[PDB]
Each structure stands twice: as structure tokens, then as C-alpha cells.
């Protein structure tokens with residue numbers, strides 16, 4: 001579809017998967033990444049701060065090297081879309097760049113095209129295929145995921161296609177977005193990345209009772225937290241009137257000992273399951 005901003009808009013809201021994480025003002029509802037309304041103008045500001053040549057160069061860097069600069073308030077969750085699974089072609093990334101420049105600015109197609117030699121070609125990805133050291137299947141991993149008899153049951157906290165229970169984020173479709181490496185890190189190092197909105201907060205009530213957990217809901221009169229302990233979850237409803245302090249923290253309520261609770265086989269099975277959630 002070429003390299004125009006109109007083509008980039010279809011890709012951003014389509015095969016580029018950008019809108020599964022990024023909203024744009026009132027269009028879309030995703031929150032894993034920042035709202036991209038006015039991105040073009042704050043790209044100029046980032047480029048100034050980071051000593052880059054132009055806002056566009058910052059936009060390029062944000063795609064080709066998402067880890068190189070991490071927007072305040074977010075963790076290293078953005079994938080390299082020219083790598084699997086997304087495997088976004090080079091012409092499509094050039095189009096997306098044109099769309100990003102349109103978010104509060106004007107696309108500059110000549111200037112975008114000079115960056116073509118910096119955009120990796122998806123077909124030429126260097127990522128090695130994922131081959132687990134054991135034969136496992138996604139179906140086997142689905143069984144593990146929802147197995148209430150185990151010492152950890154992903155389904156107690158995650159929903160997939162209407163099955164499971166909501167504590168952490170819904171995992172439907174994450175296999176089309178994320179890498180096996182991200183699944184490994186998510187399972188064995190759960191606080192390395194905290195999905196936006198699923199932070200733990202420390203609450204102290206006026207009476208001096210502590211509650212530490214994630215926010216399920218937040219009304220004018222009630223704060224409902226989900227607490228975790230030894231793989232179990234429980235809700236507490238805290239009157240807003242009685243809250244003395246509330247501080248966000250960097251621990252995830254996802255258990256930190258899953259490497260002790262899953263076998264090697266179960267672990268690689270679950271990963272095959274996540275990869276399959278397209």
C-alpha cells in the first residue's frame with residue numbers, strides 16, 4: 001500500500017499491532033503504551049533532550065530500538081516489530097513513520113525515505129527460531145494454564161477467550177505481539193516489566209491498617225484491591241474516606257516463584273500456549 005500516512009494509519013490500527021498498546025486520544029482504548037496524540041510535537045522535544053537530529057530520528061529509533069529510550073512511567077514491553085512474531089515489512093514501517101509524523105505534525109516522505117537503510121527487513125531477521133529443549137504443544141500448555149491442581153494456575157489471574165479469571169491483563173492475542181523471550185521473562189521475572197495499570201499499591205488506612213495489592217476498581221467511595229498470598233487472591237474493599245496514603249510500587253502481584261512451581265515440561269508447554277494466542 002506504499003509509504004503514505006494513509007497507508008501507515010491502516011498498519012498502525014492493523015497488522016502493525018501498534019493500537020493493541022497505543023491509543024490516540026479518544027480513538028482506541030489500549031493502555032500498555034502511551035497515548036500517541038500529539039506524538040509528532042513531543043518527538044521534537046525528545047530529540048532535543050536526547051541530542052538526536054530531528055523528531056523523526058527519535059520516531060525511527062523508537063521502532064528500531066524500543067529499549068534505547070524508555071518513556072517515563074513505562075517499562076520495556078514494546079517489541080521490535082520487524083522481528084517475529086509481528087514481522088512488519090520495511091515498507092510498512094516507513095508508512096507507519098509517515099502516520100506518526102501526522103499526529104500533530106506534517107509527514108515528510110523524502111526525509112522518511114532516507115532512513116530506509118536503518119530499518120531492518122523482517123524477512124532478514126536474525127532472531128533464532130524458538131525450539132524448546134523438549135517436545136511440547138500449545139494444547140499441552142493450555143491444560144497447564146488452567147490446571148487448578150497445580151501450585152500455580154495462570155487461569156486464576158488471566159483470561160483467554162472468555163476462560164479464566166481477571167486479575168492480571170487478558171492474554172488473548174498476545175502470541176501475535178510478544179516474543180517467547182518476553183514470555184520467559186514475564187513468567188520467571190514478573191516484576192521486570194509491570195503492565196501499565198497493574199501496579200501494586202501500598203495503602204495505609206487512617207486506623208493504620210496496611211493493604212498491598214493491585215487496584216481492581218476505584219470509585220468515588222470505594223477502593224477495591226486484589227491481594228495475593230501464596231498463589232491465592234482475595235479482594236478487599238477499602239472506603240475512600242478511610243485511606244490515609246497510597247503509593248505505587250514496582251512489585252507485581254504475579255507470583256515470583258513460578259520457576260519453583262512448574263516443571264521444565266510444564267514451563268515450556270505454557271510458553272508454547274502463549275505463542276499460539278493469535
Ligand code: HEC
Pocket residue numbers: 012016017018019020021022032033034039042046059062063066067069070071074075076077078079081088096100177
Ligand atoms: C505493546 C506491547 C506495544 C506495542 C505493540 C507498541 N508499542 Fe510503542 N510503546 C509501548 C510502550 C510501553 C512505550 C513506552 C516505552 C518505550 O519503549 O519508550 C512505547 C513507546 C513508543 C513510542 C515513543 C512514544 C513517546 O511518547 O516518546 C513510539 C513512537 C512508539 N512506541 C511507536 C509504536 C509503533 C509505531 C508501534 C506499532 C508498529 C508500537 N509502538 C507498538 C508499547 C507498545
Ligand code: HEC
Pocket residue numbers: 077145152153154155156157158167168169174182183186187190191193194195198199214228231232233252253254255258270274
Ligand atoms: C495472579 C496471582 C497471577 C498469576 C497466578 C499469574 N499471573 Fe501473570 N500477571 C499477573 C499480573 C497482575 C500481571 C500484570 C503485572 C505484570 O507482572 O506485568 C501479569 C502479567 C503477565 C504477562 C504479561 C502480560 C502482557 O500483557 O504483557 C504474562 C505473559 C503473564 N502474566 C503470564 C502468566 C503465566 C503464563 C501464568 C501462569 C504460569 C501467570 N501469568 C500467572 C498476575 C498473575
Ligand SMILES: [Ca+2]
Pocket residue numbers: 062065066067068069070071078
Ligand atoms: Ca522506547
Ligand SMILES: [Ca+2]
Pocket residue numbers: 186189190191192193194195252
Ligand atoms: Ca510482568
Ligand SMILES: [Ca+2]
Pocket residue numbers: 220221240241
Ligand atoms: Ca466520600
Ligand SMILES: [Ca+2]
Pocket residue numbers: 212227228229
Ligand atoms: Ca501480597
Ligand SMILES: [Ca+2]
Pocket residue numbers: 234
Ligand atoms: Ca486475608
